[PDB]
Amino acid sequence: TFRRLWPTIAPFKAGLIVAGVALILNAASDTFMLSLLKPLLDDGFGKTDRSVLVWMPLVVIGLMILRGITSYVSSYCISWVSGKVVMTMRRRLFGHMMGMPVSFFDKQSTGTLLSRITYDSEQVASSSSGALITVVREGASIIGLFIMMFYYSWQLSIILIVLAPIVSIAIRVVSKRFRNISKNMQNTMGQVTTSAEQMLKGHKEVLIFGGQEVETKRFDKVSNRMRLQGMKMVSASSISDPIIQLIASLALAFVLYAASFPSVMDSLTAGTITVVFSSMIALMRPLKSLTNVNAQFQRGMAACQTLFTILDSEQEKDEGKRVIERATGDVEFRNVTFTYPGRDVPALRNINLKIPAGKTVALVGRSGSGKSTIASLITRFYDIDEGEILMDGHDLREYTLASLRNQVALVSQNVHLFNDTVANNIAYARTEQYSREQIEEAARMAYAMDFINKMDNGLDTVIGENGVLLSGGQRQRIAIARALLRDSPILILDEATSALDTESERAIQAALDELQKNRTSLVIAHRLSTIEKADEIVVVEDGVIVERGTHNDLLEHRGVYAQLHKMQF
Amino acid sequence: TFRRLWPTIAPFKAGLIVAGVALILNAASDTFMLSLLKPLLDDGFGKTDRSVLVWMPLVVIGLMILRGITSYVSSYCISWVSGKVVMTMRRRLFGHMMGMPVSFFDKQSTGTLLSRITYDSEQVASSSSGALITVVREGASIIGLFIMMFYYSWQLSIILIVLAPIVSIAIRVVSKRFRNISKNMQNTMGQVTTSAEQMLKGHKEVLIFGGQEVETKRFDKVSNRMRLQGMKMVSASSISDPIIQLIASLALAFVLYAASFPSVMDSLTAGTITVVFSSMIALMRPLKSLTNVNAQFQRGMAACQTLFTILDSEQEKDEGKRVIERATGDVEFRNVTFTYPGRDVPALRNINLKIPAGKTVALVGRSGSGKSTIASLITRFYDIDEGEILMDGHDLREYTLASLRNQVALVSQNVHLFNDTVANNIAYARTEQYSREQIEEAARMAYAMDFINKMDNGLDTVIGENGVLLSGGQRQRIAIARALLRDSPILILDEATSALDTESERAIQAALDELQKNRTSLVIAHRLSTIEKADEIVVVEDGVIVERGTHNDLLEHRGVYAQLHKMQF
């Protein structure tokens, strides 16, 4: 249909001209081999010219080195072009895929994304280069054959060509006329077998009514109506093939007769008949493959219309200019209404919260709807529907995304750990600034240097999966080290519940205390010590704030807090 | 394997001789046709203009008809044999499956009994006769072609059949040597695409940590590693075909070289090289199809062991000689316990019953397990386990089958009506002894003559399936007409279902009443129309009958039957 793919191809066309010059020579080295059938039967055994029988082997090996070399120059130089319009347009998606909104990667697409940069990105050039191999090779074999047919004997070529569609249409009308009769009599047999199906259902009355002789004599007339009709299908179906063969071979009598009696013909001498009759046996194969070209240039371009919807899609909204470097202040909510895309229930309904300068606040609860989403609203993973979150006196939508995202931390158990060294995993996208001394000192400050010591090299060993496959405590404390070294002002402590082994909960808890010793903290938690030591607690139950006060006043008014402490304790 | 099918084929062996004489002549006319290539190319065009060219076209249609009328004689006289060893074998199963017990027919095989007569009995002769028209037609063309090979220049034939297996084994070892490299580099591709898969997981940490340019300068070094390994499969998997073609054409070079010898080139003329070379391309297909003569003979004989177990399973137990003409007496039970075959839980517990002469007994209950079982074992559809049943002073085991089953009369709504006329559906298996006037009078005595008079003929019209498609109300009174006409002394009335229809329930109740002025009648009844007038009432409780009394005593003692009236009402 459309070709917007051709600006990608147009840097690399010097591999396509070589694959269309050294591919025609794969078709003119086959119609130059069939023309050797003329001297072999003419100047060869019939005469006493032995010398034509000695150079003919040397032009048979010599014409399949040329058919074995241009089948390698045209399959490699078309793999360099169909390998660099698969490579270029696969790294164009992955410069736009890491800029698309999280909502697309939420539940809209999970694992079919690899099916757009491994499988649906290969069929755009493994089935659209099958519309240039078939057109050029089997579109120049046919011209060579139609030249070799007309140079040798123009008189017989017209006779043979004219008889070609008549045989096909006669065969087609005969086949239709017999499959109609076959379908009719198959329907008749299907009508007959119903009574034989029914005869086995009366077994509960055949025995008690005393008659098996009636039901074994009345089956002698159903089976005899299933043989005299059952033998007629092969009597009316095996007659069609002799008719087809006789119709086909009546024309081969006319081809021989036309080359017999007129003296306008018989310019043929025993090699000019083998080279024209056996050429077009090898012309039927470059006639069934050329007609299936547009069945392949509609799959190799239907898969390009799929990849043009992943691309040119709406990216992150960057309608902001305000830049914040060090967010020292308060974060508050105002009239914030938000629900998840693709869902109906509202999660956020006019929520008013305030985070003071450096004091921690705990959003505890067992609701499972309201605690996890507010980290997304803060980090602007999901944009707010209606309302405003005032971050240091300004809305987040006024702020640029890169400046806003740098002021936050996401310490959690479920971190994904990259395939790089310690100097790169704790210093992601800051390695050109951060020296290794402050990196290793922050690693000691995270109380996880002991696990780095028990390693292959230590501070420059690979970490991520396909490598060492570390445990969750090392992942949590390396996330602690990352957020400690980056020194973010605002911290969303997830504090995920897991196994707390002796002298493993101690190191994790000490690292947590050292991290939250300073700085503002909105902590989601199920930990009793962080519940009691929090300055102000906030409980959200199904999007409803039951109270906003201290833990002692939340002990005085029960509500849901003590009922939560039933399972906390 | 063990062909016991042969005695059903041996009287029809005269069709397998015509189909083995008129099938050889379909393979000696594909050999007598290629031998025309020698007078056409040598004695035809090369010598003169009109020598052999006017005599050949009257042969190429002469051979065609001698092949179109031996593809109809050998395809009809084998289907007279493969359609008469199916018919003899199909109606031998239906002289054995109509005398074999109900233990086959209760859910062991329900719809698969049709696919042992219709489809499975066809594959014993549609796939065992396809292993004879292959071993004879394409086992006589090969012997035919190997005469043309050796009458026409045997030296070239010897040096060509020497050369063929070397080419075959060289092609095989080359294909293996390249498929090893292909699968190894496919695994090498799999590792790289796993490493490419492991990148899109950390989107939630790509955005927040500020690193997007790292993931666009790391995917560049993954895509090049995924392109230089994607070029190499096309580079290394496209060397196999030129090597195969060059190895193949070196043999043709050797043949054309050895044709230059003065010993070989003595009997090779303008002809005699086309017929030898082009008959081998017509010899690969009969050599190929021959190998599958034992992959089809053991498909059409392995389906002759499926239906031979139907022919070998156990039939009726007829170990008995006692007979009775008309059972005028009692039927009594002796603590008989019986469970259905294929089950462990006893469907019927210990039951003790007494049936008087000319009185009604009722097996009333809503349990649905035990009342119909007693009717089955009484008519001896299933043989009993624990004890004996004395019918007229003798056990049922002592009695023969047709003596006992001619004394019962099953009456229900689920009667199956044969597709033969009503004239004989009221006198089934006894239409000769009874004349038409008795059938007419018994039709009026069953109060069903009025609906017969509404029909197209009356006495001799089609009444079963696929005709007028009768209702269950007509089926009830035609069953009463049947059970009144045969005049059985024991009436197992099942009472059908309670569907009162004005002036249909009246006729049904009148026929049901008039049937039972006389004769011993064990009835099963979920309806109250017979219980209040019953002489003796027994009531089954789950699986055991514990209350065997009168109506007034069963009104005095509640038990179960009183509550059965309570939620019956």
Side-chain angles (χ1 to χ4, degrees):
Chain A
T1 324
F2 83 96
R3 292 265 287 189
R4 219 188 320 179
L5 176 77
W6 212 82
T8 310
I9 289 176
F12 328 85
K13 60 189 163 45
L16 274 183
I17 275 175
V18 183
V21 153
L23 204 39
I24 271 167
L25 260 63
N26 209 357
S29 163
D30 178 44
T31 78
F32 262 11
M33 181 145 38
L34 279 178
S35 95
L36 294 178
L37 252 51
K38 149 134 189 176
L40 178 78
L41 306 179
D42 202 78
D43 307 352
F45 319 122
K47 314 170 83 142
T48 60
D49 209 353
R50 326 177 82 258
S51 196
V52 86
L53 205 49
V54 202
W55 70 250
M56 197 149 325
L58 265 299
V59 302
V60 156
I61 313 163
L63 280 192
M64 301 276 248
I65 296 139
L66 201 74
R67 202 179 141 87
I69 275 176
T70 71
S71 187
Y72 190 79
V73 179
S74 64
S75 92
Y76 167 69
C77 299
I78 213 151
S79 210
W80 180 89
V81 155
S82 148
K84 292 203 78 167
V85 305
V86 165
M87 181 255 268
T88 279
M89 182 225 78
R90 261 205 297 231
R91 72 164 58 145
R92 194 123 68 93
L93 294 196
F94 209 84
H96 169 87
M97 250 177 178
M98 311 315 258
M100 281 195 69
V102 194
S103 181
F104 184 62
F105 306 94
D106 211 355
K107 194 47 217 73
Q108 288 203 11
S109 297
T110 73
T112 49
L113 295 174
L114 193 67
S115 153
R116 310 240 183 278
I117 59 173
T118 300
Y119 175 51
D120 277 334
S121 190
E122 177 87 331
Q123 308 292 326
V124 84
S126 160
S127 288
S128 167
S129 83
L132 205 88
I133 278 176
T134 299
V135 175
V136 160
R137 181 177 42 177
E138 276 95 63
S141 196
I142 214 171
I143 291 301
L145 288 180
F146 267 132
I147 278 301
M148 205 190 47
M149 271 185 38
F150 276 75
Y151 175 52
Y152 270 135
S153 167
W154 83 272
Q155 299 112 354
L156 200 87
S157 100
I158 305 181
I159 303 298
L160 203 34
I161 285 303
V162 160
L163 288 182
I166 323 285
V167 162
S168 79
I169 63 166
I171 281 179
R172 270 161 188 172
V173 299
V174 161
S175 188
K176 177 190 176 188
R177 270 173 174 166
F178 278 103
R179 294 172 271 81
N180 286 337
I181 307 184
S182 174
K183 290 163 193 175
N184 291 359
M185 262 180 15
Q186 175 51 238
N187 164 67
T188 319
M189 173 51 157
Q191 201 282 319
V192 171
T193 172
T194 294
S195 184
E197 181 206 70
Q198 185 261 105
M199 291 285 248
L200 294 117
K201 294 200 175 322
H203 195 197
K204 294 267 181 323
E205 297 133 25
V206 159
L207 313 179
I208 185 173
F209 277 128
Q212 299 98 347
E213 260 282 333
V214 167
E215 220 80 10
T216 199
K217 158 180 91 63
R218 212 221 285 145
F219 198 71
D220 288 17
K221 300 161 17 185
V222 165
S223 193
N224 239 11
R225 274 161 35 185
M226 219 151 56
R227 159 189 90 85
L228 292 167
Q229 178 305 322
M231 90 164 57
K232 271 182 31 194
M233 271 155 268
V234 299
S235 188
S237 86
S238 94
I239 174 184
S240 76
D241 269 297
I243 292 296
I244 287 176
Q245 282 176 358
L246 179 65
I247 282 301
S249 282
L250 261 182
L252 188 144
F254 188 72
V255 167
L256 253 49
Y257 174 55
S260 305
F261 201 78
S263 318
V264 195
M265 200 145 301
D266 258 331
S267 73
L268 320 183
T269 88
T272 45
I273 188 52
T274 321
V275 80
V276 58
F277 177 80
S278 72
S279 90
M280 81 175 47
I281 309 184
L283 190 141
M284 308 275 156
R285 199 214 48 163
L287 219 37
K288 101 171 51 173
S289 285
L290 202 163
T291 200
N292 298 342
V293 155
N294 254 44
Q296 255 188 351
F297 197 88
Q298 257 171 14
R299 191 193 284 103
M301 261 285 318
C304 198
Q305 214 152 29
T306 301
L307 308 184
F308 255 99
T309 65
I310 266 61
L311 193 60
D312 57 85
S313 277
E314 276 188 331
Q315 254 190 9
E316 301 146 40
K317 327 280 200 63
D318 212 324
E319 44 244 38
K321 195 50 69 194
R322 264 315 184 197
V323 166
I324 172 63
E325 292 213 339
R326 186 59 190 254
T328 53
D330 294 348
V331 154
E332 34 199 356
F333 276 54
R334 187 191 313 263
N335 293 53
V336 175
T337 89
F338 173 77
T339 181
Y340 271 16
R343 314 288 298 268
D344 278 3
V345 286
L348 273 293
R349 83 221 61 181
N350 196 272
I351 307 294
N352 232 39
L353 311 166
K354 172 251 292 183
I355 291 128
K359 312 189 185 315
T360 183
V361 277
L363 281 53
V364 300
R366 34 91 191 171
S367 178
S369 307
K371 313 185 311 297
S372 316
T373 175
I374 201 147
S376 303
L377 263 65
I378 287 179
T379 51
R380 262 205 54 135
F381 271 41
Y382 301 120
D383 209 315
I384 322 163
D385 260 336
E386 283 173 349
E388 39 180 344
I389 279 154
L390 228 43
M391 190 301 277
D392 216 9
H394 291 86
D395 202 18
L396 316 149
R397 306 195 209 81
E398 316 166 3
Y399 282 126
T400 50
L401 227 58
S403 203
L404 154 55
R405 250 79 165 275
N406 195 72
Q407 315 292 328
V408 82
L410 255 188
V411 169
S412 175
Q413 191 102 24
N414 198 357
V415 295
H416 150 250
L417 242 185
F418 302 92
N419 319 318
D420 268 320
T421 69
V422 171
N424 295 338
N425 271 10
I426 316 194
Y428 196 100
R430 217 62 44 90
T431 325
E432 68 255 40
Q433 181 201 351
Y434 274 140
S435 150
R436 278 186 35 98
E437 181 59 48
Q438 42 206 131
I439 288 168
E440 71 193 26
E441 257 270 22
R444 302 167 158 173
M445 202 96 88
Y447 291 9
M449 183 46 108
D450 162 78
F451 264 120
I452 316 293
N453 290 321
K454 312 187 177 185
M455 294 300 293
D456 314 348
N457 191 18
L459 271 283
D460 272 87
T461 325
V462 289
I463 288 105
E465 74 278 348
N466 88 338
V468 171
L469 199 40
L470 300 72
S471 77
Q474 339 196 35
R475 284 181 151 188
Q476 171 131 335
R477 286 142 84 220
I478 213 174
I480 282 274
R482 222 189 305 191
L484 212 167
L485 156 54
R486 294 274 282 281
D487 210 13
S488 166
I490 302 180
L491 157 52
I492 329 168
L493 250 170
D494 214 275
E495 237 167 43
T497 51
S498 274
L500 62 80
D501 190 31
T502 311
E503 279 327 288
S504 315
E505 192 42 62
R506 161 68 43 87
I508 283 174
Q509 179 92 10
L512 285 183
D513 166 54
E514 184 80 10
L515 180 65
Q516 75 184 345
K517 162 76 180 175
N518 210 33
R519 100 165 38 75
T520 79
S521 164
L522 164 155
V523 54
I524 83 165
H526 323 303
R527 170 71 38 81
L528 62 148
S529 61
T530 325
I531 278 174
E532 200 270 337
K533 85 177 159 186
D535 300 14
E536 290 176 349
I537 207 173
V538 164
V539 183
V540 164
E541 287 312 314
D542 305 7
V544 172
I545 323 173
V546 297
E547 270 97 15
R548 293 176 49 193
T550 67
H551 93 287
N552 35 288
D553 299 338
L554 261 289
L555 280 165
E556 293 171 354
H557 325 116
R558 326 289 166 188
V560 86
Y561 176 74
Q563 295 63 44
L564 160 73
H565 262 276
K566 292 172 181 302
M567 51 86 88
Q568 292 290 315
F569 284 169
Chain B
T1 317
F2 313 87
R3 293 254 315 268
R4 219 180 320 179
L5 181 77
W6 186 254
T8 85
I9 300 182
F12 316 97
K13 77 193 177 319
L16 289 178
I17 301 309
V18 158
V21 162
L23 209 30
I24 274 175
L25 266 66
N26 204 7
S29 96
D30 303 344
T31 310
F32 268 34
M33 218 159 160
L34 298 174
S35 182
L36 297 180
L37 260 53
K38 200 248 177 68
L40 166 82
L41 281 166
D42 187 273
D43 206 14
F45 304 137
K47 182 159 299 181
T48 66
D49 39 55
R50 314 222 192 98
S51 290
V52 85
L53 265 178
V54 85
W55 161 92
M56 194 152 336
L58 261 301
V59 156
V60 75
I61 328 166
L63 288 171
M64 277 315 296
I65 63 183
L66 187 106
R67 149 175 180 82
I69 328 176
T70 72
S71 188
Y72 196 92
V73 186
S74 100
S75 199
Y76 161 74
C77 294
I78 193 135
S79 266
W80 181 89
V81 158
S82 164
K84 255 186 163 279
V85 309
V86 158
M87 181 255 268
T88 279
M89 156 148 280
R90 268 179 180 149
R91 76 156 71 123
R92 199 205 297 269
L93 295 189
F94 211 88
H96 196 237
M97 266 184 330
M98 277 305 136
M100 142 176 301
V102 193
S103 176
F104 200 174
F105 280 73
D106 37 14
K107 284 172 294 295
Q108 271 212 42
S109 299
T110 50
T112 83
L113 280 199
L114 185 69
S115 279
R116 302 237 191 285
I117 285 177
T118 302
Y119 164 99
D120 162 66
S121 206
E122 188 83 346
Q123 257 57 28
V124 81
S126 162
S127 288
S128 169
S129 88
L132 169 72
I133 72 167
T134 282
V135 85
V136 158
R137 198 206 98 81
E138 305 178 9
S141 89
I142 289 170
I143 284 304
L145 288 185
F146 270 123
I147 293 313
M148 271 183 14
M149 218 145 262
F150 282 81
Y151 185 39
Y152 284 166
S153 211
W154 55 272
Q155 306 114 339
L156 188 95
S157 81
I158 287 188
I159 87 163
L160 211 163
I161 69 174
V162 155
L163 279 183
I166 325 283
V167 157
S168 194
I169 67 184
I171 286 178
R172 284 197 213 273
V173 299
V174 158
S175 184
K176 179 187 174 187
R177 271 200 175 109
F178 278 102
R179 265 159 304 93
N180 291 340
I181 309 186
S182 176
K183 292 189 292 185
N184 285 351
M185 260 170 39
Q186 173 55 234
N187 164 57
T188 322
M189 197 29 185
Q191 196 265 317
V192 190
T193 174
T194 280
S195 177
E197 172 36 44
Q198 259 176 28
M199 191 95 58
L200 295 117
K201 301 276 169 204
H203 195 127
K204 315 259 188 160
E205 309 135 37
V206 156
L207 263 49
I208 180 187
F209 283 122
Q212 285 122 338
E213 64 152 323
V214 162
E215 302 302 278
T216 61
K217 292 166 54 215
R218 172 135 48 95
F219 198 70
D220 293 3
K221 303 153 54 204
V222 174
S223 191
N224 271 6
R225 199 188 310 168
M226 208 164 58
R227 198 246 320 179
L228 301 175
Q229 216 77 14
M231 212 155 68
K232 268 156 46 64
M233 281 166 248
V234 191
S235 171
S237 147
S238 197
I239 316 170
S240 82
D241 275 29
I243 287 302
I244 285 159
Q245 274 172 8
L246 180 67
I247 283 303
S249 287
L250 266 156
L252 198 146
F254 193 84
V255 171
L256 253 49
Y257 176 50
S260 147
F261 279 133
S263 161
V264 167
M265 223 203 86
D266 173 79
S267 85
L268 285 178
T269 61
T272 304
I273 179 64
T274 326
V275 47
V276 186
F277 177 73
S278 178
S279 97
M280 262 186 235
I281 84 179
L283 198 134
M284 304 266 142
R285 191 207 59 151
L287 223 53
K288 154 196 312 187
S289 307
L290 252 193
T291 66
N292 307 352
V293 78
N294 214 273
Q296 242 184 6
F297 190 65
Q298 277 296 322
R299 205 272 282 277
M301 173 55 189
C304 202
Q305 294 174 334
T306 304
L307 70 104
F308 216 83
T309 57
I310 317 294
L311 253 178
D312 270 347
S313 297
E314 293 211 300
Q315 239 185 12
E316 293 177 350
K317 328 283 198 63
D318 316 313
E319 289 84 5
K321 204 43 75 195
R322 265 273 164 271
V323 290
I324 192 46
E325 199 267 331
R326 170 118 177 194
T328 87
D330 295 5
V331 168
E332 31 188 343
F333 277 55
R334 215 144 311 166
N335 240 6
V336 182
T337 309
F338 166 79
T339 170
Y340 279 7
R343 224 60 53 177
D344 292 359
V345 50
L348 192 83
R349 279 141 183 89
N350 307 56
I351 310 301
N352 214 54
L353 294 176
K354 171 63 66 74
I355 292 181
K359 286 162 86 273
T360 177
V361 307
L363 263 65
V364 53
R366 45 87 185 178
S367 297
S369 38
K371 34 189 180 52
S372 70
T373 288
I374 278 195
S376 302
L377 53 89
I378 274 195
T379 195
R380 204 179 30 146
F381 271 29
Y382 302 118
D383 270 296
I384 84 157
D385 269 354
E386 255 87 13
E388 46 167 348
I389 302 175
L390 223 57
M391 182 305 278
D392 212 11
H394 291 85
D395 204 15
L396 310 164
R397 293 182 183 174
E398 324 286 336
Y399 281 129
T400 82
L401 177 63
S403 37
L404 155 68
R405 285 222 197 85
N406 208 217
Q407 312 288 334
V408 283
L410 275 177
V411 168
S412 180
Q413 198 95 60
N414 208 329
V415 298
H416 162 257
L417 247 177
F418 306 102
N419 52 353
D420 164 30
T421 179
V422 40
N424 293 336
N425 270 7
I426 330 179
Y428 185 81
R430 289 237 270 266
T431 184
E432 250 309 306
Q433 187 207 351
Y434 315 155
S435 87
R436 298 309 181 185
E437 174 66 36
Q438 330 171 218
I439 304 170
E440 305 201 340
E441 195 52 84
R444 314 171 151 151
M445 260 197 267
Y447 293 10
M449 192 45 108
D450 319 328
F451 257 84
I452 302 303
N453 285 315
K454 303 307 183 65
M455 262 195 68
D456 78 88
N457 193 17
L459 194 131
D460 261 296
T461 166
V462 174
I463 199 95
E465 47 150 355
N466 86 5
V468 290
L469 198 34
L470 278 206
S471 76
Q474 294 220 57
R475 281 176 154 189
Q476 200 94 340
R477 35 193 166 275
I478 192 66
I480 317 304
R482 191 145 48 169
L484 177 63
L485 189 50
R486 305 200 61 156
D487 212 329
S488 313
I490 303 184
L491 323 179
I492 298 85
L493 210 184
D494 290 32
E495 282 277 339
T497 51
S498 185
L500 188 138
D501 186 22
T502 299
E503 279 321 293
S504 306
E505 181 54 49
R506 190 249 192 180
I508 282 171
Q509 182 81 18
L512 278 187
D513 162 56
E514 183 80 9
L515 163 74
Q516 64 191 4
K517 315 333 294 165
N518 214 359
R519 305 147 191 180
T520 69
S521 82
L522 163 154
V523 298
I524 87 178
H526 86 92
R527 189 171 52 121
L528 82 158
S529 177
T530 325
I531 320 174
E532 289 183 350
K533 53 185 297 190
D535 214 306
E536 285 153 300
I537 183 186
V538 310
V539 50
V540 65
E541 317 207 1
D542 289 345
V544 51
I545 306 186
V546 308
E547 284 176 339
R548 308 175 169 86
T550 83
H551 183 27
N552 190 26
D553 301 345
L554 258 286
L555 283 200
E556 288 173 341
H557 322 116
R558 304 307 177 281
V560 152
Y561 153 74
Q563 300 54 231
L564 167 63
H565 272 7
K566 292 306 161 54
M567 319 65 68
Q568 174 252 312
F569 284 162

